[PDB]
Amino acid sequence: ISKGFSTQTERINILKAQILNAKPCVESERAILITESFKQTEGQPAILRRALALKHILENIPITIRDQELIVGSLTKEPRSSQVFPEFSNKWLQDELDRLNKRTGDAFQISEESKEKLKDVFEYWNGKTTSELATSYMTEETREAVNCDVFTVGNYYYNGVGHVSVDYGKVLRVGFNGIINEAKEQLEKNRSIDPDFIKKEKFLNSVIISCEAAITYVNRYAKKAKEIADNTSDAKRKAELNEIAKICSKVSGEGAKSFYEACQLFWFIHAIINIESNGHSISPARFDQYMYPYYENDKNITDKFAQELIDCIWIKLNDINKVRDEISTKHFGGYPMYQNLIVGGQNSEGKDATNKVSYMALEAAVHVKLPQPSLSVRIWNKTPDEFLLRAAELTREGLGLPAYYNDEVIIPALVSRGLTLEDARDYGIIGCVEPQKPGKTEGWHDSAFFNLARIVELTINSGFDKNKQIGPKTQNFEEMKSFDEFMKAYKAQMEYFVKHMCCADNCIDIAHAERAPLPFLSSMVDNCIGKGKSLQDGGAEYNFSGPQGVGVANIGDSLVAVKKIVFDENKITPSELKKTLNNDFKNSEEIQALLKNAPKFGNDIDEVDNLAREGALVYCREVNKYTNPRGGNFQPGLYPSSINVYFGSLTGATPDGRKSGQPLADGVSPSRGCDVSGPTAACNSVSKLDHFIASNGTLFNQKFHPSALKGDNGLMNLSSLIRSYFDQKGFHVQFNVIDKKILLAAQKNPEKYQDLIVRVAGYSAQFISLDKSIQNDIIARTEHVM
Amino acid sequence: ISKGFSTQTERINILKAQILNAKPCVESERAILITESFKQTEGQPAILRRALALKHILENIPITIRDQELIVGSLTKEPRSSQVFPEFSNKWLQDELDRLNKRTGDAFQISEESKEKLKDVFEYWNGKTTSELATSYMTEETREAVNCDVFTVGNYYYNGVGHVSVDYGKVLRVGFNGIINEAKEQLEKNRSIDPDFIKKEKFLNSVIISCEAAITYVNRYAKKAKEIADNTSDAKRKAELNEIAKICSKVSGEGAKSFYEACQLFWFIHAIINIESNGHSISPARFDQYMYPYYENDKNITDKFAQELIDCIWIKLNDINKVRDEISTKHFGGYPMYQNLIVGGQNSEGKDATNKVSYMALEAAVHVKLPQPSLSVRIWNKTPDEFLLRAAELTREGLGLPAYYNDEVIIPALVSRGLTLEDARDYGIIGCVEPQKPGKTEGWHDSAFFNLARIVELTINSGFDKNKQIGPKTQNFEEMKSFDEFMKAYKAQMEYFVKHMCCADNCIDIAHAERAPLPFLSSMVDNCIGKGKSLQDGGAEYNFSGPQGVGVANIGDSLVAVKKIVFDENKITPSELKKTLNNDFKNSEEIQALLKNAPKFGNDIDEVDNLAREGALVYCREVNKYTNPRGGNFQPGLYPSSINVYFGSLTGATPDGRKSGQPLADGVSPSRGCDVSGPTAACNSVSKLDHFIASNGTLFNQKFHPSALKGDNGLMNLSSLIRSYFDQKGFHVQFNVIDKKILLAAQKNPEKYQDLIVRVAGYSAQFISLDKSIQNDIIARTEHVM
């Protein structure tokens, strides 16, 4: 049955309004502070410079407690804003200072004072960032390949890494004091005359300095609270502020005991990670698993208050923001932080792990209705029916939540990559769809985006592009007599560019280790303290690197068109197709129609579905060949964030009939309007791809007309649709359930739809914050009925 | 028979005068240039910054050709001067700017303009030197131990490492082009997707840039020579300059063919090493072995011209200088560079290797009569009588040359340390007395000086010094009942301080690898190119670290006095001795007499000789426990440069009767005036020490009255003396043969004795350039007769 959802407290409505009414801006406090610290630590090893910088930032960064907050800790004075991280890159900011407020979507405000104060920042960091060192490590040939419009490694180049779920459970138990004591104990075990312990010693002392700074940070809020309380007339709020001061004072260094304490300490851990570095996809992961014990053992708290606290955490997760350069902003549209939080699933012994907090998380999504966190649910053979149905009820709300993940495929895929069965069973999701064992991994889950469609274009043009030979000079398409020769050339182009993408990633990897090893973050991930080395230096138990392929449906549809129309039926010659594509079908609409009418991916047609599979596998097999400086293996993923639109604008006409400059397909979803046989047939098609090899994750989007989810049958049908796709070995699926008229109305009168949330790809966003190009891509997606 | 020596050409007299008439100063060109370069390579890996800096320096450093020179290449405009190396340290220079010319010995001039230009240098390098990073890596306990007046690790802390004999022979054969080609071949062999090759690729390309810069440097002299030739009227000199231009143009990339070419290329290799870094002890080593082939195959050169060219090399070796801070200057007095050049010995087959150049080297020492190079000879069982007698003839000249080394102990000692028998047989000496296989070693042969006498002082005072517990709190001397308890405490004090000295050395080791890896030097030492790693990063086939113990005779004489006077005969109680030493024998000359009359080292008395041996072994055994960051073992040495005087000034009264502040003994030589049984008895005593374990070398000084070497009998006696010491496993021996009246006269009227040369310890120096304290220590040494 459909029970519906409860109503959130007025407090939640007030806090939510603070987020939406905010005017996202760029603040300079952090930038000024890290610059000041580095100027004083020139003769110190990088790890200590990082620890002392975090200390200086945490001791002097402005503190803020917003009205009516129960959970405190704000990274910026203005809500939903961003600090600056000049240690990674900053010249892009220097260039865009005067046009940040002129953007359509993802606009940021910045004061004249901030622009002025940043001048010295740009001056000091010149040549001292991770981005600049990364480029120096790259060969000239790699630099050229990086700038050929085939792939981008900008994510970890311009900003921090992130993409990790730390051991939140451990810190909640032992507190910052517990971590410090573990570091001190290791220091004693390491007492030795062996030279190798010299650097380990510096790392362990850097962890101590960092955690001591965290304790100081929390204490500043404890003092701030009392200060505000003493100046508060309202007895109720005054009592609240005094309780906050009390909780902050305890969890400043000690572990949590009660649920309120666990919630507040959780946020401080999460918040401070975001102060040390701006890598995104800092994912809470299995929140329901590590938070439940505190809820269950709290014999005084009521469910209503426990739920209100969770709602507050949901709101806080929407307070964090991150400014990016104008190009990268096209890759990550809608002020996204990608903080994935997942509930449900099984435990290490293979038994169901659903609990009370699992359901409270689902409830919170409806109470708050904001883009973050990226709520997800794990599904397996023994998922309780009531759990899946409750998730279905949430999907009916039209927030794009929750994302569904398949334990049956993910667990085996992870064990295949080296995780123990116990660790694989305890997986959580990073960012959009990247799985990992929390607290034991440095996965680099979004190290790059690779345009698969461009490889098809370069195959047809023999590596020649814009009157320049950017790729290998493979066999001239005009001379090919078989589809086999085509696939060989395709593989040759793929091989060349994947090689340089992975090499570029490795250079950026080395740069982060050399200039930005992270003491605080590393202390909360296994073996780092025990090994006496940072995450950047390979301290994690598990190490990977994960680059994404974009354009799967376009490749399958293009490959089958080439094979059928050109080589099998000989309707047109290779020369004719090459010329038609290079002219964007000008005066050859009859040829384009032939291509458009060829079999399309997403209709359960094996002929094309198997080519989408093989086309993607060529990319995946190349990625698997590489290893990173941390001794880990590269693993491919197939998701696009919002880059399918941008990549499309840089891609010429393709054999599937798509015109030049048009968006590519998102994730492994069928191309727009191509899936005309119903959602089940579409699911069947997508399930044919190899979701096991793409262990960094694959993303499948489906959009339903609201009528499809109506009533109990609607929930039953969605549930059946999901189970069938997962039984067929699909990796992930998520759904948009909205009235198309509402999206169109939002474009015309944004002001009237500030709270409208929509699913982009692996994350949801405030529709009006998205660039029109992305809004239109979402509106153009196929709309299904059950 | 005494052959006598030939007379050098007038040209040699003119060139020699340029050295002696020069006014040693500090120039700023190099410092300004390296600063310019580093400011432009901030985003480059350290190895490339080093290669690009060398390139900038070599392309823009002033070039100078001195009048009448046949071999060209000057590091400074003024002869016998020094450039500045701010990358290692510079604040000491900033502090001493106005008192460098107020020094008595080792004085340096510096223009007001240079002082002005260095202001920006000091500003830029603040916190960016190797010295500052080294301190950061040291623990607080180590920093304190380093400043307790027990040992010093300043050599590699304030300046470059050096202490190496590169593969001169290889470069003479293949030229800089050959080295570049080898790096390019390795680059091709390394083509791979493995991330580990990224850093190797940068190293190899740095070698290429560095060697290409070397070629450019040589071509600059080629052009300069021709320019000077065009403004030279004298036909003879004009032809000389045109020949120089011709030779430089060839060896500017190609290997040498003629002897003149080999001599010029040799100097360029040596000179450029001294531009990249200022570590001293850059030693030519077996010059006679790699230069002889070019002499023998040169069918046109006359012996007189070949000799004149060698004489020119000798003078060029005296043109290089290095300014050091006030304190360090006390450790290395007399403008020393310690460039050891050795001749004679056996080859890898175990056959004698004496040749014509071996003899021309001995002749050159008499033709030039300057402090450099530090000429040495190898002696073994089958050394030709003619060779040893010729070396004896040179000793009679009274220049302190040559130093004699014993193959019979050195070869086994080296194999014991890991060298193959073939490599050990091909050893050369580094600096003062440190053996190594040239072209395959990174030995850090003078990483520290350790005051052994202070350990005795601290044993008596239970680690308490200057009202502070600086060492371990060992058993109170007053409560000791046996000499065994004393020796146990002695070992405990030794253990503590040696541990921190080696740890401090390792921190400096890491700092050099992190901030000053050397591309040029590394290219000429084996496995570096093949391994794709610098010398600082462990690329050498053989790796070691070598700290020196100072005060051997003082320890032996002190230990036997404690054992006999206190514990054996009970003449005085431990308390009485402790009090008298702390009072520097004030009002207790009867007790000092007792100590002075105890058996002394150097008289062939086993009771004391065995304690000098055991005392030194306690130090040696502690040093052997350590390893460096390059995977090599520490090996002890027993030599003092000129630091025995300075160390003595920091040491209180000792049990041997020596008063507070007096100089300590030099190397393993007996204390002044203590060896009263003749030189043979002295040699017998010294031979009882373990010269095999002290593989970093031991130094033995003896001084004879001129009458002792008179006539053929004198030479025969000196020869017999040396062979007897070596047959007993002595490591090295050298002799001063001069009239004491001459030394005293030189102190009263310096300008009258500008060309007077004297042996200090492992090196000879212009007597008048030495501080009076060092002059007096030399004058006070025991004077023997056969």
Side-chain angles (χ1 to χ4, degrees), chain B residues 304-332:
Chain B
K304 185 172 185 179
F305 190 50
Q307 183 67 59
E308 181 170 39
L309 289 175
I310 292 177
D311 294 336
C312 284
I313 289 296
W314 253 234
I315 294 172
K316 292 307 300 177
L317 290 159
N318 281 277
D319 202 19
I320 300 186
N321 205 340
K322 170 186 181 178
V323 62
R324 307 185 177 77
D325 66 273
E326 297 181 307
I327 301 297
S328 300
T329 298
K330 298 175 186 298
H331 309 180
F332 315 104

Side-chain angles (χ1 to χ4, degrees), chain A residues 14 20 44 96 182 320 419 453 469 566 696 717 744 765 783:
Chain A
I14 295 173
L20 295 178
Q44 211 72 226
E96 293 175 44
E182 172 163 46
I320 303 180
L419 279 68
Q469 191 66 43
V566 180
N696 197 47
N717 286 331
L744 293 179
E783 170 181 283

Side-chain angles (χ1 to χ4, degrees), chain B residues 599-611:
Chain B
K600 295 287 177 291
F601 176 65
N603 292 286
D604 205 2
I605 298 175
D606 288 334
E607 179 171 50
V608 54
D609 293 354
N610 287 326
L611 284 175

Side-chain angles (χ1 to χ4, degrees), chain A residues 37 47 89 114 186 235 246 295 297 301 395 500 629 636 638 735 784:
Chain A
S37 182
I47 190 71
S89 73
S114 289
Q186 189 63 56
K246 177 180 181 176
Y295 161 78
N297 297 325
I301 194 171
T395 295
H500 288 292
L638 299 168
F735 316 84
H784 288 287

Side-chain angles (χ1 to χ4, degrees), chain A residues 42-43 127 136 195 202 515 627, chain B residues 42-43 127 136-137 195 202 515 627:
Chain A
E42 300 281 2
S136 297
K202 297 315 173 190
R515 292 184 175 183
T627 61
Chain B
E42 215 67 58
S136 293
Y137 272 125
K202 297 312 174 186
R515 294 183 172 187
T627 61

Side-chain angles (χ1 to χ4, degrees), chain B residues 691-704:
Chain B
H691 293 272
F692 291 83
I693 191 169
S695 50
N696 197 49
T698 70
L699 186 147
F700 182 25
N701 267 315
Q702 273 202 155
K703 181 175 64 180
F704 281 89

Side-chain angles (χ1 to χ4, degrees), chain A residues 514-589:
Chain A
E514 191 169 324
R515 292 184 175 183
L518 307 187
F520 185 71
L521 185 70
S522 298
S523 68
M524 300 178 284
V525 181
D526 273 358
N527 301 8
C528 284
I529 291 177
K531 300 291 184 180
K533 52 194 296 194
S534 67
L535 245 16
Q536 295 64 41
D537 291 297
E541 168 63 26
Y542 300 116
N543 285 278
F544 303 104
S545 285
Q548 280 41 265
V550 182
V552 179
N554 303 93
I555 276 50
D557 297 336
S558 294
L559 290 179
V560 78
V562 168
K563 177 184 173 294
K564 291 182 61 73
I565 306 302
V566 180
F567 299 102
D568 293 330
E569 313 182 320
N570 301 303
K571 288 301 183 67
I572 58 179
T573 65
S575 298
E576 297 181 299
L577 181 61
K578 178 175 176 176
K579 293 182 182 177
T580 307
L581 295 173
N582 289 314
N583 301 317
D584 193 37
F585 304 116
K586 179 180 180 177
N587 300 309
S588 48
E589 293 165 50

